Curated annotation (Swiss-Prot):
Record's subcellular location: Cytoplasm; Cytoplasm, Perinuclear region; Cell membrane; Cell junction, Focal adhesion
Full-protein positions shown: 419 to 691 of 1009
GO molecular function: ATP binding; calcium/calmodulin-dependent protein kinase activity; ionotropic glutamate receptor binding; neurotransmitter receptor regulator activity; non-membrane spanning protein tyrosine kinase activity; protein tyrosine kinase activity; signaling receptor activator activity
Encoding gene per record: PTK2B
Miscellaneous comment as given in the Swiss-Prot or TrEMBL entry: Promotes bone resorption, and thus PTK2B/PYK2 inhibitors might be used to treat osteoporosis.
Record bears the keyword tRNA-binding: no
Subunit structure of this chain's protein: Homodimer, or homooligomer. Interacts with SIRPA and SH2D3C. Interacts with ARHGAP10. Interacts with DLG4. Interacts with KCNA2. Interacts with NPHP1, ASAP1, ASAP2, ARHGAP26, SKAP2 and TGFB1I1. Forms a signaling complex with EPHA1, LCK and phosphatidylinositol 3-kinase; upon activation by EFNA1. Interacts with GRB2 (via SH2 domain). Interacts with P53/TP53 and MDM2. Interacts with MYLK. Interacts with BCAR1. Interacts with PDPK1. Interacts (hypophosphorylated) with PXN. Interacts with RB1CC1.
One annotated GO biological process: positive regulation of phosphatidylinositol 3-kinase/protein kinase B signal transduction
Name of the protein in question: Protein-tyrosine kinase 2-beta
Modification comment: Phosphorylated on tyrosine residues in response to various stimuli that elevate the intracellular calcium concentration; this activation is indirect and may be mediated by production of reactive oxygen species (ROS). Autophosphorylation occurs in trans, i.e. one subunit of the dimeric receptor phosphorylates tyrosine residues on the other subunit.
High-level lineage: Eukaryota, Metazoa, Chordata, Craniata, Vertebrata
Keywords: Adaptive immunity, Angiogenesis, ATP-binding, Cell junction, Cell membrane, Cell projection, Cytoplasm, Immunity, Kinase, Membrane, Nucleotide-binding, Nucleus, Phosphoprotein, Transferase, Tyrosine-protein kinase
Tissue: Most abundant in the brain, with highest levels in amygdala and hippocampus. Low levels in kidney (at protein level). Also expressed in spleen and lymphocytes.
Reported disease: Aberrant PTK2B/PYK2 expression may play a role in cancer cell proliferation, migration and invasion, in tumor formation and metastasis. Elevated PTK2B/PYK2 expression is seen in gliomas, hepatocellular carcinoma, lung cancer and breast cancer.
Active-site feature positions: 131 (proton acceptor)
Cleavable signal peptide: none
Amino acid sequence: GIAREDVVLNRILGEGFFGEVYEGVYTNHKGEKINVAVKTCKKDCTLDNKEKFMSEAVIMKNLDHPHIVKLIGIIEEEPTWIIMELYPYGELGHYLERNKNSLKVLTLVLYSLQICKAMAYLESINCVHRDIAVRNILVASPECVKLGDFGLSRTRLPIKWMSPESINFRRFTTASDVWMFAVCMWEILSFGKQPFFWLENKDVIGVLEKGDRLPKPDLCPPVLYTLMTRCWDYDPSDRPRFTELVCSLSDVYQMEKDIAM
Ligand SMILES: O=C1C=c2cc(Nc3ncc(C(F)(F)F)c(NCc4ccccc4S(=O)(=O)N4CCCC4)n3)ccc2=N1
Protein backbone atom coordinates (compact mmCIF):
# COMPACT_ATOMS: atom_id res chain seq x y z
CA GLY A 1 0.00 0.00 0.00
CA ILE A 2 0.89 3.68 -0.62
CA ALA A 3 -0.05 7.10 0.89
CA ARG A 4 -1.91 10.33 0.10
CA GLU A 5 1.38 12.22 0.04
CA ASP A 6 2.25 10.16 -3.17
CA VAL A 7 -0.76 11.11 -5.32
CA VAL A 8 -1.12 14.48 -6.87
CA LEU A 9 -4.51 15.11 -8.49
CA ASN A 10 -4.92 17.26 -11.61
CA ARG A 11 -8.44 17.03 -13.03
CA ILE A 12 -11.77 15.34 -12.88
CA LEU A 13 -11.76 12.36 -15.32
CA GLY A 14 -15.50 11.77 -15.11
CA GLU A 15 -18.43 10.77 -12.97
CA GLY A 16 -18.60 7.03 -12.24
CA PHE A 17 -21.53 5.22 -10.69
CA PHE A 18 -19.47 6.12 -7.59
CA GLY A 19 -18.63 9.55 -8.90
CA GLU A 20 -15.40 11.24 -9.51
CA VAL A 21 -12.43 9.48 -11.11
CA TYR A 22 -9.60 11.90 -11.30
CA GLU A 23 -6.52 11.97 -13.49
CA GLY A 24 -3.44 12.59 -11.32
CA VAL A 25 0.17 11.37 -10.76
CA TYR A 26 1.47 8.67 -8.48
CA THR A 27 5.14 8.92 -7.54
CA ASN A 28 7.03 5.70 -6.68
CA HIS A 29 8.00 4.72 -3.07
CA LYS A 30 11.53 4.59 -4.84
CA GLY A 31 11.35 7.69 -7.09
CA GLU A 32 9.31 7.44 -10.38
CA LYS A 33 6.29 9.33 -12.01
CA ILE A 34 3.41 7.03 -13.13
CA ASN A 35 0.39 8.81 -14.58
CA VAL A 36 -2.80 7.65 -12.81
CA ALA A 37 -6.62 7.39 -12.45
CA VAL A 38 -8.13 7.67 -8.96
CA LYS A 39 -11.56 6.38 -8.20
CA THR A 40 -13.36 7.75 -5.17
CA CYS A 41 -16.91 7.48 -3.73
CA LYS A 42 -19.65 10.11 -4.58
CA LYS A 43 -21.06 12.02 -1.70
CA ASP A 44 -22.03 8.47 -0.86
CA CYS A 45 -25.03 6.50 0.26
CA THR A 46 -24.71 5.47 3.88
CA LEU A 47 -23.51 1.91 3.32
CA ASP A 48 -25.02 0.51 0.19
CA ASN A 49 -22.45 2.59 -1.73
CA LYS A 50 -19.24 2.57 0.21
CA GLU A 51 -19.83 -1.17 0.41
CA LYS A 52 -19.99 -1.71 -3.31
CA PHE A 53 -16.81 0.38 -3.59
CA MET A 54 -14.78 -1.62 -1.05
CA SER A 55 -16.07 -4.63 -2.65
CA GLU A 56 -14.80 -3.58 -6.08
CA ALA A 57 -11.62 -2.59 -4.32
CA VAL A 58 -11.01 -5.94 -2.72
CA ILE A 59 -11.57 -7.99 -5.87
CA MET A 60 -9.12 -5.71 -7.53
CA LYS A 61 -6.14 -6.49 -5.18
CA ASN A 62 -6.46 -10.10 -6.43
CA LEU A 63 -6.93 -9.49 -10.17
CA ASP A 64 -4.10 -9.52 -12.57
CA HIS A 65 -4.31 -9.71 -16.23
CA PRO A 66 -3.00 -7.87 -19.37
CA HIS A 67 -6.49 -7.09 -20.47
CA ILE A 68 -8.14 -5.82 -17.34
CA VAL A 69 -7.43 -2.42 -15.95
CA LYS A 70 -4.23 -2.47 -13.94
CA LEU A 71 -4.56 -1.73 -10.22
CA ILE A 72 -1.58 0.20 -8.84
CA GLY A 73 -2.70 0.58 -5.16
CA ILE A 74 -5.20 1.71 -2.59
CA ILE A 75 -5.30 4.31 0.18
CA GLU A 76 -7.61 3.19 2.99
CA GLU A 77 -8.88 6.15 5.03
CA GLU A 78 -11.43 8.90 4.50
CA PRO A 79 -11.72 9.25 0.93
CA THR A 80 -10.39 5.83 0.38
CA TRP A 81 -8.70 6.01 -2.99
CA ILE A 82 -8.39 3.30 -5.62
CA ILE A 83 -5.43 3.95 -7.85
CA MET A 84 -5.26 2.50 -11.35
CA GLU A 85 -2.94 3.13 -14.23
CA LEU A 86 -4.18 5.81 -16.60
CA TYR A 87 -5.13 4.80 -20.23
CA PRO A 88 -4.73 7.96 -22.11
CA TYR A 89 -7.09 7.00 -25.04
CA GLY A 90 -10.34 6.43 -23.04
CA GLU A 91 -13.54 4.51 -23.66
CA LEU A 92 -13.33 2.15 -26.62
CA GLY A 93 -16.81 3.25 -27.61
CA HIS A 94 -15.40 6.63 -28.62
CA TYR A 95 -12.04 5.34 -29.85
CA LEU A 96 -14.05 3.85 -32.60
CA GLU A 97 -16.72 6.32 -33.46
CA ARG A 98 -13.57 8.50 -34.16
CA ASN A 99 -11.72 5.79 -36.19
CA LYS A 100 -14.36 4.21 -38.35
CA ASN A 101 -11.69 4.30 -41.05
CA SER A 102 -8.28 3.82 -39.59
CA LEU A 103 -9.36 0.24 -38.28
CA LYS A 104 -9.09 -3.20 -40.00
CA VAL A 105 -11.41 -6.04 -38.84
CA LEU A 106 -8.14 -7.84 -37.98
CA THR A 107 -8.15 -5.19 -35.20
CA LEU A 108 -11.84 -5.29 -34.21
CA VAL A 109 -11.30 -9.10 -33.54
CA LEU A 110 -8.11 -8.76 -31.69
CA TYR A 111 -10.13 -6.41 -29.32
CA SER A 112 -12.92 -9.03 -28.82
CA LEU A 113 -10.30 -11.59 -28.66
CA GLN A 114 -8.60 -9.92 -25.77
CA ILE A 115 -11.67 -9.16 -23.75
CA CYS A 116 -12.67 -12.79 -24.10
CA LYS A 117 -9.38 -13.76 -22.70
CA ALA A 118 -10.13 -11.34 -19.90
CA MET A 119 -13.39 -13.21 -19.30
CA ALA A 120 -11.71 -16.63 -19.30
CA TYR A 121 -9.46 -15.55 -16.47
CA LEU A 122 -12.44 -14.04 -14.60
CA GLU A 123 -14.32 -17.32 -14.95
CA SER A 124 -11.46 -19.18 -13.37
CA ILE A 125 -11.22 -16.95 -10.32
CA ASN A 126 -15.08 -17.09 -10.32
CA CYS A 127 -15.75 -13.48 -10.90
CA VAL A 128 -18.19 -12.07 -13.12
CA HIS A 129 -18.44 -8.88 -14.95
CA ARG A 130 -21.69 -7.09 -15.33
CA ASP A 131 -20.53 -4.27 -17.56
CA ILE A 132 -18.74 -5.78 -20.69
CA ALA A 133 -19.74 -2.83 -22.88
CA VAL A 134 -17.67 -0.62 -24.97
CA ARG A 135 -18.00 2.58 -22.84
CA ASN A 136 -16.80 0.45 -20.01
CA ILE A 137 -13.57 -0.65 -21.77
CA LEU A 138 -10.36 1.26 -22.02
CA VAL A 139 -7.82 1.48 -24.88
CA ALA A 140 -4.21 1.32 -23.58
CA SER A 141 -2.66 1.45 -27.09
CA PRO A 142 -4.30 0.89 -30.45
CA GLU A 143 -3.00 -2.69 -30.15
CA CYS A 144 -4.59 -3.31 -26.76
CA VAL A 145 -7.82 -2.89 -24.82
CA LYS A 146 -8.47 -3.39 -21.00
CA LEU A 147 -11.79 -4.29 -19.49
CA GLY A 148 -13.61 -2.09 -17.08
CA ASP A 149 -13.50 -2.87 -13.37
CA PHE A 150 -16.87 -1.65 -12.46
CA GLY A 151 -19.32 -4.36 -13.02
CA LEU A 152 -16.66 -6.57 -11.45
CA SER A 153 -18.30 -8.86 -8.90
CA ARG A 154 -18.94 -12.02 -6.84
CA THR A 155 -31.14 0.44 -10.77
CA ARG A 156 -29.59 1.43 -14.17
CA LEU A 157 -29.37 -2.07 -15.79
CA PRO A 158 -27.82 -2.70 -19.22
CA ILE A 159 -30.89 -4.63 -20.27
CA LYS A 160 -30.00 -4.07 -23.94
CA TRP A 161 -27.01 -6.15 -23.09
CA MET A 162 -28.49 -8.83 -20.78
CA SER A 163 -29.24 -12.52 -21.41
CA PRO A 164 -33.00 -13.29 -20.95
CA GLU A 165 -32.45 -15.17 -17.63
CA SER A 166 -30.36 -12.31 -16.40
CA ILE A 167 -33.54 -10.25 -16.91
CA ASN A 168 -36.41 -12.57 -15.85
CA PHE A 169 -34.52 -13.82 -12.69
CA ARG A 170 -31.61 -11.31 -12.02
CA ARG A 171 -29.16 -14.28 -12.26
CA PHE A 172 -25.77 -13.28 -13.67
CA THR A 173 -23.89 -16.53 -14.16
CA THR A 174 -21.02 -17.12 -16.47
CA ALA A 175 -23.36 -18.19 -19.23
CA SER A 176 -25.18 -14.91 -19.16
CA ASP A 177 -21.78 -13.33 -19.28
CA VAL A 178 -21.14 -15.21 -22.49
CA TRP A 179 -24.28 -13.77 -23.95
CA MET A 180 -23.33 -10.27 -22.80
CA PHE A 181 -19.88 -10.63 -24.14
CA ALA A 182 -21.15 -11.41 -27.56
CA VAL A 183 -23.28 -8.33 -27.34
CA CYS A 184 -20.01 -6.44 -26.73
CA MET A 185 -18.46 -8.18 -29.83
CA TRP A 186 -21.26 -6.95 -31.80
CA GLU A 187 -20.47 -3.47 -30.54
CA ILE A 188 -16.92 -3.49 -31.45
CA LEU A 189 -17.48 -4.79 -35.05
CA SER A 190 -20.20 -2.24 -35.15
CA PHE A 191 -17.79 0.60 -34.36
CA GLY A 192 -19.64 1.52 -31.14
CA LYS A 193 -23.25 1.22 -32.21
CA GLN A 194 -25.90 1.03 -29.46
CA PRO A 195 -27.40 -2.55 -29.42
CA PHE A 196 -31.18 -2.36 -29.98
CA PHE A 197 -31.05 1.43 -30.31
CA TRP A 198 -34.62 1.29 -31.60
CA LEU A 199 -36.40 -0.45 -28.70
CA GLU A 200 -36.45 0.83 -25.16
CA ASN A 201 -35.93 -1.68 -22.41
CA LYS A 202 -39.52 -2.82 -21.47
CA ASP A 203 -39.98 -4.80 -24.78
CA VAL A 204 -36.56 -6.32 -25.30
CA ILE A 205 -37.42 -9.72 -23.77
CA GLY A 206 -40.34 -10.14 -26.12
CA VAL A 207 -37.97 -9.70 -28.96
CA LEU A 208 -35.51 -12.41 -28.03
CA GLU A 209 -38.56 -14.66 -27.30
CA LYS A 210 -40.08 -14.78 -30.84
CA GLY A 211 -36.37 -15.38 -31.52
CA ASP A 212 -34.96 -12.04 -32.57
CA ARG A 213 -31.21 -11.32 -32.91
CA LEU A 214 -28.94 -8.33 -33.43
CA PRO A 215 -28.13 -7.46 -37.07
CA LYS A 216 -25.02 -9.01 -38.56
CA PRO A 217 -22.22 -6.41 -38.52
CA ASP A 218 -20.89 -5.42 -41.93
CA LEU A 219 -17.27 -5.81 -41.14
CA CYS A 220 -17.95 -9.18 -39.48
CA PRO A 221 -17.43 -12.51 -41.19
CA PRO A 222 -19.93 -15.38 -41.50
CA VAL A 223 -18.19 -17.70 -38.92
CA LEU A 224 -17.72 -15.11 -36.33
CA TYR A 225 -21.34 -13.94 -36.64
CA THR A 226 -22.43 -17.51 -36.04
CA LEU A 227 -20.13 -17.86 -33.15
CA MET A 228 -22.04 -14.83 -31.70
CA THR A 229 -25.21 -16.43 -32.59
CA ARG A 230 -24.50 -19.35 -30.38
CA CYS A 231 -23.66 -17.06 -27.48
CA TRP A 232 -27.24 -15.82 -27.92
CA ASP A 233 -28.72 -19.35 -27.87
CA TYR A 234 -31.85 -18.88 -25.74
CA ASP A 235 -30.91 -22.06 -23.82
CA PRO A 236 -27.83 -21.24 -21.62
CA SER A 237 -26.48 -24.75 -22.16
CA ASP A 238 -25.90 -24.43 -25.81
CA ARG A 239 -23.78 -21.22 -25.33
CA PRO A 240 -20.05 -21.71 -25.76
CA ARG A 241 -17.99 -21.47 -22.56
CA PHE A 242 -15.21 -18.92 -22.27
CA THR A 243 -12.19 -21.23 -22.91
CA GLU A 244 -14.17 -22.35 -25.99
CA LEU A 245 -14.41 -18.72 -27.23
CA VAL A 246 -10.74 -18.14 -26.60
CA CYS A 247 -9.41 -21.17 -28.54
CA SER A 248 -11.82 -20.49 -31.34
CA LEU A 249 -11.54 -16.68 -31.55
CA SER A 250 -7.93 -17.01 -31.53
CA ASP A 251 -8.80 -19.00 -34.73
CA VAL A 252 -10.87 -16.40 -36.53
CA TYR A 253 -8.00 -14.02 -36.02
CA GLN A 254 -4.87 -16.11 -36.87
CA MET A 255 -7.06 -16.73 -39.90
CA GLU A 256 -7.06 -13.06 -40.28
CA LYS A 257 -3.45 -12.10 -40.15
CA ASP A 258 -3.61 -14.69 -43.01
CA ILE A 259 -6.11 -12.88 -45.34
CA ALA A 260 -3.60 -10.02 -44.73
CA MET A 261 -0.95 -9.92 -47.52
O1 LIG B 1 -11.56 11.99 -22.28
C1 LIG B 1 -11.21 11.02 -21.60
C2 LIG B 1 -9.73 10.60 -21.54
C3 LIG B 1 -9.82 9.37 -20.62
C4 LIG B 1 -8.86 8.52 -20.12
C5 LIG B 1 -9.18 7.41 -19.28
N1 LIG B 1 -8.17 6.52 -18.81
C6 LIG B 1 -8.47 5.63 -17.86
N2 LIG B 1 -7.54 4.78 -17.39
C7 LIG B 1 -7.89 3.94 -16.41
C8 LIG B 1 -9.19 4.07 -15.94
C9 LIG B 1 -9.64 3.18 -14.87
F1 LIG B 1 -8.64 2.23 -14.74
F2 LIG B 1 -10.02 4.00 -13.81
F3 LIG B 1 -10.80 2.46 -15.20
C10 LIG B 1 -10.08 5.03 -16.37
N3 LIG B 1 -11.35 5.19 -15.80
C11 LIG B 1 -12.26 6.33 -16.13
C12 LIG B 1 -13.34 5.69 -17.00
C13 LIG B 1 -13.26 4.37 -17.45
C14 LIG B 1 -14.33 3.90 -18.22
C15 LIG B 1 -15.49 4.60 -18.61
C16 LIG B 1 -15.58 5.88 -18.14
C17 LIG B 1 -14.50 6.41 -17.36
S1 LIG B 1 -14.65 8.05 -16.73
O2 LIG B 1 -13.66 8.82 -17.40
O3 LIG B 1 -14.83 7.82 -15.33
N4 LIG B 1 -16.16 8.58 -17.31
C18 LIG B 1 -17.49 8.32 -16.68
C19 LIG B 1 -18.49 9.39 -17.27
C20 LIG B 1 -17.91 9.71 -18.67
C21 LIG B 1 -16.37 9.51 -18.47
N5 LIG B 1 -9.70 5.82 -17.36
C22 LIG B 1 -10.47 7.20 -18.96
C23 LIG B 1 -11.39 8.09 -19.49
C24 LIG B 1 -11.15 9.17 -20.28
N6 LIG B 1 -12.00 10.15 -20.84
